[PDB]
């Protein structure tokens, strides 16, 4: 996350660290308790993945040097990439993660609701980016979770910013005109979150963007309330 600030413990319950473990164990993306055995993420993350043996989802982090062989984690039993599914750019950068075991819902670790199919028109006015990933272009992991207060453009604009794209109403994206917050690398899979009317929604997956926190450059995310039918249908 640029231009951050570091979250509390127990701020964003809802966010999980996906680590892969081969060779060595690292946080690869970002993701979101959506239900008792169900992370919700960005289908990009599984680039470099052939099988679901090698992932490790940690609830609960504020710091990822917290995380010792006896800090605890779920398995992760099955992942679903969105079948239209191609690169980040094109759209459809959603994924569920289907844990091996299920979640004890707790202060450190609970579900955040989905966007309500009805609510597809409303333009959030509270939102809010948070992870683990580099606070410039040129940096490493942060190690505490970082959050960044960033507001949402039309399409119509991201459109214009974009040019050389599609942004579909499948995107969503957000930032300042003049940059300086904004998601950057390894936050990738992670909540846009939005509180309406004193509830948090889960609005957006941190997508791609051009560079981190450019001027006029928003971070683009897969505008989940899009998706609600495909992750219900997933999830049955
Ligand atoms: N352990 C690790 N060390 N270093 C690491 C680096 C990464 C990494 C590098 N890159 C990423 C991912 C993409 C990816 C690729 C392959 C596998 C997994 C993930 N992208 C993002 O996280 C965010 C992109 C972004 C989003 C928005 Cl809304 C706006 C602007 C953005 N950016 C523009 N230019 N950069 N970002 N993740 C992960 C783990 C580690
Ligand atoms: C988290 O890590 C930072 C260093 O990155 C350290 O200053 C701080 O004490 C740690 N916080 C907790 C709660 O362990």
């Not at 127990?10 to 970002?30: I, Y």
């Not at 004890?104 to 199919?117: E, F, G, H, M, V």
């Not at 490493?140 to 453009?153: D, G, S």
């Not at 940059?179 to 979150?193: R, V």
Request: overall charge positive; aromatic content about 10%; some cysteine.
């Amino acid at each position: 996350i640029v231009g951050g600030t570091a979250s509390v413990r127990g701020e964003w319950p809802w966010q999980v660290t996906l680590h892969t473990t081969s060779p060595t164990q690292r946080h690869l993306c970002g993701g979101s308790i959506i239900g008792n055995q169900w992370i919700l993420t960005a289908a990009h993350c599984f680039y470099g993945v052939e099988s679901p043996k090698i992932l490790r989802v940690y609830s609960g982090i504020l710091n990822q040097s917290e995380i010792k062989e006896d800090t605890s984690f779920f398995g992760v039993q099955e992942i679903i990439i969105h079948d239209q599914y191609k690169m980040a750019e094109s759209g459809y950068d959603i994924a569920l993660l289907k844990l091996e075991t299920t979640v004890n819902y707790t202060d450190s670790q609970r579900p955040i609701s989905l966007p309500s199919k009805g609510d597809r028109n409303v333009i959030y006015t509270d939102c809010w980016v948070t992870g683990w990933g580099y606070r410039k272009l040129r940096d490493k992991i942060q190690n505490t979770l970082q959050k960044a207060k960033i507001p949402l453009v039309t399409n119509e604009e991201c459109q214009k910013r974009y040019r050389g794209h599609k942004i579909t109403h499948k995107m969503i994206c957000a930032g300042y005109r003049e940059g300086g917050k904004d998601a950057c690398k390894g936050d990738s899979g992670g909540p846009l979150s939005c509180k309406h009317n004193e509830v948090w929604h889960l609005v957006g997956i941190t997508s791609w963007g051009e560079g981190c926190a450019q001027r006029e450059r928003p971070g683009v995310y897969t505008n989940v309330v899009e998706y609600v039918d495909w992750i219900l249908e997933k999830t049955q």
